[PDB]
Amino acid sequence: LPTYKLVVVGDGGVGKSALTIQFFQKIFVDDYDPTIEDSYLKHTEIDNQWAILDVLDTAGQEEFSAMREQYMRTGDGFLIVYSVTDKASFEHVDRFHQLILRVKDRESFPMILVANKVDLMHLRKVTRDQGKEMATKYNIPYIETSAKDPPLNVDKTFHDLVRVIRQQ
Ligand SMILES: Nc1nc2c(ncn2[C@@H]2O[C@H](COP(=O)(O)OP(=O)(O)NP(=O)(O)O)[C@@H](O)[C@H]2O)c(=O)[nH]1
Ligand SMILES: [Mg+2]
C-alpha cells in the first residue's frame, strides 16, 4: 500500500491535535490521555483504494521550528488549520501557505484549508465566505470542521487531502 504523510499546521490552539486525535482515537482532546500514545498511523480505504495514513501533528507556537521544519519537508500534503474564533489564526493562513511552498520549493503543493471549531456558533469571528475566499485565492479546497463531539468533517478532511495528493 502507499503511505501518505499528512502534515497538520496552523497557529497554537486551533485544534490541530484535536482533529488528529479525533481521526485516529475517536475521542476529544480534552478527554484524551496521551500517556499511552504512539505515532498516528492507520490503514484505511479511500475511494476503493486502501492506503496507510501517517499523520504528523505540528506544535503551533513559533518556538517549535525544528519539528515544523522536518515535518513540512517530509509531508506529502498539508492541512492548514485555523480556528473560526481566532481571527489571527485565520490571517496567519497566508504565512503557512508561503512557508509550505518555501520548504517544498514548489509553486503549488497538496493542501486543504481547514476552518475548525465551527460548533462555537456564538463565538465565531471568521465567516464561511471569508474562508472560501481565502481558499479560492490559493486555488485549494475549503472545509469546515469540529473536533468536539459530535465531530464534523474530520474523516472527510483527511480523506480529501489524500484525494488531492492522488489527483495532483
Ligand atoms: N469547541 C471546540 N474546541 C476545540 C475544537 N478543537 C479544539 N478545541 C479546543 O481548542 C483547544 C486547543 O486544542 P488543541 O487540539 O490542543 O490545539 P492545537 O492546535 O493542537 N495546539 P498546539 O499548537 O499548541 O499544539 C482545547 O481547549 C480544545 O478543547 C473544536 O473543534 N471545537
Ligand atoms: Mg497540538
UniProtKB/Swiss-Prot annotation:
Origin species: Mus musculus (Mouse)
Reaction equation(s) it catalyzes: GTP + H2O = GDP + phosphate + H(+)
UniProt function note: Signal transducer in the Ras-MAPK signaling pathway that regulates cell proliferation and survival. Core component of the SHOC2-MRAS-PP1c (SMP) holophosphatase complex that regulates the MAPK pathway activation. The formation of the SMP complex only occurs when MRAS is GTP-bound. MRAS has low intrinsic GTPase activity and may require additional factors for activation. The SMP complex specifically dephosphorylates the inhibitory phosphorylation at 'Ser-259' of RAF1 kinase, 'Ser-365' of BRAF kinase and 'Ser-214' of ARAF kinase, stimulating their kinase activities.
Entry keywords, A to Z: Cell membrane, GTP-binding, Hydrolase, Lipoprotein, Membrane, Methylation, Nucleotide-binding, Prenylation
Protein name as it appears in the record: Ras-related protein M-Ras
Entry GO MF terms: G protein activity; GTP binding; GTP-dependent protein binding
Protein's GO biological process: cellular response to leukemia inhibitory factor; Ras protein signal transduction
Binding residues for Mg(2+): S17, T35, D57
Cofactor: Mg(2+)
Position of sequence motif Effector region: 32-40
Keyword flag Membrane: yes
Full protein segment contained here: 11 to 178 of 208
